[PDB]
Ligand binder design. Sequence first.
Ligand SMILES: C[C@@H]1O[C@H](O[C@@H]2[C@H](O)[C@@H](O)[C@H](O)O[C@@H]2C(=O)O)[C@H](O[C@H]2OC(C(=O)O)=C[C@H](O)[C@H]2O)[C@H](O)[C@H]1O
Ligand SMILES: C[C@@H]1O[C@@H](O[C@@H]2[C@H](O)[C@@H](O)[C@@H](O[C@@H]3[C@H](O)[C@@H](O)[C@H](C)O[C@H]3O)O[C@@H]2C(=O)O)[C@H](O)[C@H](O)[C@H]1O
Ligand SMILES: [Ca+2]
Ligand SMILES: [Ca+2]
Length: 425
Amino acid sequence: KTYYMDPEGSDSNPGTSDKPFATLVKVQEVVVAGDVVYINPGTYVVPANQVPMTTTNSGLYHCVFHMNKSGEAGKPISYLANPNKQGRPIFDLSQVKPKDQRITVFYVTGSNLYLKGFDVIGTQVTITGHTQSECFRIVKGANNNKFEDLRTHDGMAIGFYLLGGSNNHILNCDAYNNYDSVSEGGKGGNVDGFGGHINSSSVGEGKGTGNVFEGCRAWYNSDDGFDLINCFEAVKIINCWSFLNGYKPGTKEVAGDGTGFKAGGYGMAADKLPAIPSVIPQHEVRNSLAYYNRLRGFYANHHLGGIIFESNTAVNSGENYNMTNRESPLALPPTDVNGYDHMVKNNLSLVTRSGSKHIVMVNRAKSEVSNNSFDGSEEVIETDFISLEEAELMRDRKPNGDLPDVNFGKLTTDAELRFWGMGCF
Ligand SMILES: C[C@@H]1O[C@H](O[C@@H]2[C@H](O)[C@@H](O)[C@H](O)O[C@@H]2C(=O)O)[C@H](O[C@H]2OC(C(=O)O)=C[C@H](O)[C@H]2O)[C@H](O)[C@H]1O
Ligand SMILES: C[C@@H]1O[C@@H](O[C@@H]2[C@H](O)[C@@H](O)[C@@H](O[C@@H]3[C@H](O)[C@@H](O)[C@H](C)O[C@H]3O)O[C@@H]2C(=O)O)[C@H](O)[C@H](O)[C@H]1O
Ligand SMILES: [Ca+2]
Ligand SMILES: [Ca+2]
């Protein structure tokens, strides 16, 4: 019941400790509910000519791994970095460059799956126009899953991209240094760290609800860190950090929208009314940190209703809090109005950077806006913080995947009294 795989392994082997597998394709040929797969640490380079497991959207996508099989309730399938060995499994996909096809590395339709402790790097984009690739894409039917301590970095693909599925828990994952340098002149406008976009086909309790990002970090993603546009059920972002998004990796060169948390929206299309859910979901961002994104930190992103921004810290992220909503009902032309039905509470905002701002575009008559540092009588300053050394945010996680201890953006005990019960620490 416990299978093994290894970069110096063979798919002709039975998949034991002494003689392990070599690819997840063979793994998907055997597994059933309850079984474990220990993925031994090292670099697995996916061959250039490895046939896809499936395709979607009429051959628009090469799907490298179809995570199609399911566990049962209390009996999951578990794909796990081998916990008896140091280091991490790394799937390299630099070589996978199929002709005129988008790439999904993990395409998830199965339920009760548990994926932990490995990396996906080098995911390609070869298409020239409006395109994207994804490391993980999750759709209608993929329920009750867990993705933990998975790192999606140093490629061109979106980290995690949700079009459907229920109660998926994305825990302690990192999505960084991702940038599409090939398509549309290298804008990188489609490459987010984390993307919650539960489509019209996947609504209903048990079908699109209860998806949560938690403990995740998103940095140097060319577009946004986290994005919940075109999201029909409520997604929650808890205890996450989004920083240095909107830039080409390792620089302050302009790429995409550079939002830390784009926590709603259905677009401001001038030509047509966008499709929307009948109940506008109250998304939540909570106990989360935004720092030095290109343009904005915590952003309602033209949402058609309420959002919770509770107990977040925001530092030098352009517009740190922006609550801009689209007017209701849907109307052309698309007109922006002061944010309505929001819960904005217990947040902290440091602005020392040229052009940045504490809050914009909220209606205090129509939203609950209480106990935020930017509304207090005393302005927040650099001395109030124990550290502001940004390299501490890129510290390697604890051995069990939890976010590392950081002094960054944490108040001093003196400052904690003058800003009490404010911020994500
Ligand atoms: C309607 C609104 O447009 C967004 O961005 C615009 C503009 O493109 C950007 O360069 C400027 O700095 O900010 C503007 C703004 O109103 O915020 C952005 O949409 C773009 O990216 C995404 C996305 O990341 O999901 C979706 C759209 O297809 C694309 O045009 C924003 O999310 C959107 O609500
Ligand atoms: C194959 C196409 O898939 C669909 O379109 C999706 C999406 O529904 C559109 O809103 C748009 O989304 C863009 C970016 O692609 C996305 O990364 C970002 C989160 O939001 C918008 O910026 O295009 C998408 C796409 O994959 O092209 C629809 O099913 C289309 O009908 C279909 O052509
Ligand atoms: Ca964009
Ligand atoms: Ca985005």
